[PDB]
Each structure stands twice: as structure tokens, then as C-alpha cells.
Write an enzyme that holds these catalytic residues in place. Structure first.
Site, PDB file in Angstrom:
ATOM      1  N   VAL A  99      41.824  41.566  50.357  1.00  0.00           N
ATOM      2  CA  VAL A  99      40.972  40.822  49.418  1.00  0.00           C
ATOM      3  C   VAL A  99      41.755  40.223  48.229  1.00  0.00           C
ATOM      4  CG1 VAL A  99      38.725  41.758  50.195  1.00  0.00           C
ATOM      5  CG2 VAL A  99      39.895  42.835  48.241  1.00  0.00           C
ATOM      6  N   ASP A 132      47.600  42.814  30.180  1.00  0.00           N
ATOM      7  CA  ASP A 132      47.564  41.762  31.207  1.00  0.00           C
ATOM      8  C   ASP A 132      46.151  41.197  31.410  1.00  0.00           C
ATOM      9  OD1 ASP A 132      48.789  39.978  33.038  1.00  0.00           O
ATOM     10  OD2 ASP A 132      48.791  41.429  34.700  1.00  0.00           O
ATOM     11  N   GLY A 162      51.552  46.471  44.831  1.00  0.00           N
ATOM     12  CA  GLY A 162      50.690  46.785  45.966  1.00  0.00           C
ATOM     13  C   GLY A 162      49.859  45.627  46.485  1.00  0.00           C
ATOM     14  N   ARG A 182      46.103  40.355  46.023  1.00  0.00           N
ATOM     15  CA  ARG A 182      47.396  40.989  45.707  1.00  0.00           C
ATOM     16  C   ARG A 182      47.680  40.910  44.196  1.00  0.00           C
ATOM     17  NH1 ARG A 182      50.401  41.683  50.921  1.00  0.00           N
ATOM     18  NH2 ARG A 182      49.122  39.934  51.666  1.00  0.00           N
ATOM     19  N   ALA A 221      49.860  42.963  40.543  1.00  0.00           N
ATOM     20  CA  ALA A 221      51.176  43.226  39.935  1.00  0.00           C
ATOM     21  C   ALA A 221      52.069  44.000  40.904  1.00  0.00           C
ATOM     22  CB  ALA A 221      51.013  44.000  38.632  1.00  0.00           C
TER      23      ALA A 221
HETATM   24  C1  LIG Z   1      42.286  43.910  39.974  1.00  0.00           C
HETATM   25  C2  LIG Z   1      43.012  42.679  39.812  1.00  0.00           C
HETATM   26  C3  LIG Z   1      44.000  42.235  40.588  1.00  0.00           C
HETATM   27  O1  LIG Z   1      45.000  42.959  41.089  1.00  0.00           O
HETATM   28  C4  LIG Z   1      44.055  40.777  40.971  1.00  0.00           C
HETATM   29  O2  LIG Z   1      45.332  40.412  41.473  1.00  0.00           O
HETATM   30  C5  LIG Z   1      42.917  40.372  41.918  1.00  0.00           C
HETATM   31  O3  LIG Z   1      42.695  38.982  41.813  1.00  0.00           O
HETATM   32  C6  LIG Z   1      43.020  40.787  43.366  1.00  0.00           C
HETATM   33  C7  LIG Z   1      41.697  41.069  43.948  1.00  0.00           C
HETATM   34  C8  LIG Z   1      41.021  42.203  43.784  1.00  0.00           C
HETATM   35  C9  LIG Z   1      39.673  42.485  44.288  1.00  0.00           C
HETATM   36  C10 LIG Z   1      38.977  41.526  45.010  1.00  0.00           C
HETATM   37  C11 LIG Z   1      37.692  41.759  45.472  1.00  0.00           C
HETATM   38  O4  LIG Z   1      36.940  40.834  46.221  1.00  0.00           O
HETATM   39  C12 LIG Z   1      37.554  39.605  46.594  1.00  0.00           C
HETATM   40  C13 LIG Z   1      37.081  42.969  45.212  1.00  0.00           C
HETATM   41  C14 LIG Z   1      37.733  43.942  44.493  1.00  0.00           C
HETATM   42  O5  LIG Z   1      37.080  45.137  44.244  1.00  0.00           O
HETATM   43  C15 LIG Z   1      39.037  43.721  44.002  1.00  0.00           C
HETATM   44  C16 LIG Z   1      39.645  44.838  43.212  1.00  0.00           C
HETATM   45  O6  LIG Z   1      39.045  45.897  43.000  1.00  0.00           O
HETATM   46  O7  LIG Z   1      40.898  44.531  42.709  1.00  0.00           O
HETATM   47  C17 LIG Z   1      41.516  45.471  41.757  1.00  0.00           C
HETATM   48  C18 LIG Z   1      42.053  46.644  42.531  1.00  0.00           C
HETATM   49  C19 LIG Z   1      42.581  44.830  40.883  1.00  0.00           C
END
Ligand SMILES: */C1=C/C(=O)[C@@H](O)[C@@H](O)C/C=C/c2cc(OC)cc(O)c2C(=O)O[C@@H](C)C1
Length: 294
Positions: free
Chosen positions: A17, A131, A23, A19, A21
Site C-alpha cells: 500500500v 517529518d 521498510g 513505502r 522512510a
Molecule cells: C505512514 C506514512 C508513510 O510511511 C508514507 O510513506 C505512506 O504514504 C505510505 C502508505 C501508508 C499506508 C497506506 C494505506 O492505504 C493506501 C493505509 C495505511 O494504513 C498506511 C499506513 O498505515 O502507513 C503507515 C505505516 C506509515
């Protein structure tokens, strides 16, 4: 602060879903419910994953992404799945882009300041995000509820004292917040006109460059935005003060609970004469403000 100890076998890893900083983030299923997993990709990420673990274990707020628990073999963080994706994707992502209001824009920023004020109120030591930017802000409840993730590409929201290598404080998050307020009102990427690399943004910001002024922006919103942007971090308001101001301003921004459901093709950037047009409309703000004042 406490966290769940999870078996990777209990997790049904679905699709990537995003990527961050360090992992990779996948959609996943854990205990019949939908989760977001941030798995380790290299042995070097271990120190960051551990620090993120101990930090997020003590964090409990509605505007911060909930960390359900973690696995230690392999190292992976199990969090709440933010169904609405990032704020960056809502603002600037693949078309069709959703329509949003001045009320959503102010509400998202209020909610971000509420989560950051909680981090800054932390005892014995305040937690600095470092950030704050739209990729790190996630949306739930039909795009109405904002949650901060990934505590510290980022040069456009970075306070000049941070890249200066200078001793910085929680006032660096206040600067980033000011940039986000401009970004949600204009629906423009800050410093998009300045070509890469990052040092070109850093040079410009370090020399006093700030995003262009917004045509017809209410004076109380303009004052708050530019105070947050101050070169001198001591001239910036605290997050507690931004929360109070933003809370009081919401009286003139009804409709923040309306889910994102409308298509949008407004998606055309007019021009740059030192002043940009807002994407959102302040006509209703001005009308509601006049009723109260005169
Ligand atoms: C939070 C931010 C992050 O690492 C960003 O790089 C982010 O844009 C990546 C996407 C995270 C994401 C995406 C979705 O749906 C598309 C749902 C989520 O629950 C998350 C999420 O929890 O990202 C965090 C772990 C990080």
C-alpha cells in the site's frame, strides 16, 4: 506503554500500500480484521523499528495511527489500516481526485495540530515528529478523520534550522504544519516550481523563500500561517496555541464531517504572480464571520 506479541503466521499479508522512510507498508489481515503491516527489508532498519516500537508503545491519541502490536521474527509493525490512504494521494494523487472544502482543509489541519500537540505534551520528554508532511498523514471515516503516522523528499516542509544542522526543537513541526496549511488551501505541492535536487529548496528556504501568498485568504488564517513559517523558531506559535486558534476558527467552517464523495476536475493550476488562488472557497467563512461580528 505495552504492545501485542504477534506471530507472522497469524498475519495474511495482502498487497503493498506504500513505502516510507524505512521498510514497506502492506495491507494485511490479523484476527479477522484489516491491518497495515510495516515489515523490515534490511538488517540496518532494526534500530529504527525498535525506537519506533518503544515510542509508539506509549502513544495513544485519536489523531495518531494506532500500533496494535509487533512481530520480532520477522520484525514487523502491525497497525490500524487507514482505508482512506495518505493526504498526499487525496491532494495530488491519481485522477479522479476527490472534491474537498475549506472545512475539510481546516479540519485536517486542526486534527494534525491535535496529534502533534499530544506528542509535544509528552512527559518526561516531548516527542518531536520531525517529518510532518502529507505522505505521513493518513485518512479514515470517509476522508474526514486524519491520523499521523511514521515519526521521524521532505525538504519542502523542513524548518530551516533542521537542514542547517542547528539545534532544533518541537518548533520544527510548527514550521511543517504551516507549509501543510498552505498546501491544503491551494492544493499545490510546496516548491514544485523549484527544480530538484533538495539542496535547491534548502538554499531558497534558508534565504527567506516561503510559499506564495494566497489571494483572498482570511487575515486570521494568513497571520497564523506566516507566524508558523518564521525564520526565528521562537516567533512561531506552540502547537497548543495552534490547536486553540484552529478550534475557534472551525465555528466558521461547518461541514468537516461530510465524507469525500465527489469527483473533481477543477484540477488546473492557473498562474504565479507572487500570489496564488486558493483551491478552497472562503465565501462562506466571510459570511459566517460577518453574522457574528457585523
Ligand atoms: C505512514 C506514512 C508513510 O510511511 C508514507 O510513506 C505512506 O504514504 C505510505 C502508505 C501508508 C499506508 C497506506 C494505506 O492505504 C493506501 C493505509 C495505511 O494504513 C498506511 C499506513 O498505515 O502507513 C503507515 C505505516 C506509515
Amino acid at each position: 506503554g505495552s504492545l501485542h506479541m504477534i506471530d507472522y503466521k497469524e498475519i495474511e499479508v495482502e498487497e503493498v500500500v506504500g513505502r516510507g522512510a524505512f521498510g514497506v507498508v502492506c495491507k494485511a489481515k490479523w484476527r479477522a480484521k484489516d491491518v497495515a503491516i510495516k515489515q523490515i527489508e534490511s538488517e540496518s532498519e532494526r534500530k529504527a523499528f525498535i525506537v519506533e516500537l518503544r515510542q509508539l508503545s506509549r502513544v495513544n491519541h485519536p489523531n495518531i495511527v494506532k500500533l496494535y502490536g509487533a512481530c520480532l521474527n520477522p520484525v514487523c509493525l502491525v497497525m490500524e489500516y487507514a482505508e482512506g490512504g495518505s493526504l498526499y494521494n487525496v491532494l495530488h494523487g491519481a485522477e479522479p481526485l476527490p472534491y474537498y472544502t475549506a472545512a475539510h482543509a481546516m479540519s485536517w489541519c486542526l486534527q494534525c495540530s491535535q496529534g502533534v500537540a499530544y506528542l509535544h505534551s509528552m512527559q518526561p520528554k516531548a516527542l518531536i515528529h520531525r517529518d510532518l508532511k502529507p505522505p505521513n498523514l493518513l485518512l479514515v471515516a470517509g476522508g474526514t478523520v486524519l491520523k499521523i503516522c511514521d515519526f521521524g523528499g521532505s525538504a519542502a516542509w523542513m524548518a530551516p534550522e533542521v537542514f542547517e544542522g542547528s539545534n532544533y526543537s518541537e518548533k520544527c513541526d510548527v514550521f511543517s504544519w504551516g507549509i501543510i496549511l498552505w498546501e491544503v488551501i491551494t492544493r499545490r505541492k510546496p516548491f514544485d516550481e523549484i527544480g530538484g535536487p533538495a539542496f535547491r529548496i534548502m538554499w531558497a528556504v534558508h534565504n527567506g523563500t516561503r510559499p506564495p501568498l494566497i489571494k483572498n485568504l482570511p487575515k486570521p488564517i494568513e497571520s497564523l500561517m506566516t507566524r508558523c513559517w518564521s525564520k526565528d523558531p521562537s516567533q512561531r506559535p506552540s502547537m497548543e496555541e495552534i490547536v486553540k486558534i484552529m478550534t475557534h476558527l472551525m465555528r466558521y467552517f461547518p461541514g468537516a464531517d461530510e465524507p469525500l464523495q465527489y469527483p473533481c476536475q477543477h484540477s488546473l493550476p492557473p498562474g504565479e504572480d507572487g500570489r496564488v488562488e486558493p483551491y478552497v472557497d472562503f465565501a462562506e467563512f466571510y459570511r459566517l464571520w460577518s453574522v457574528d461580528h457585523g
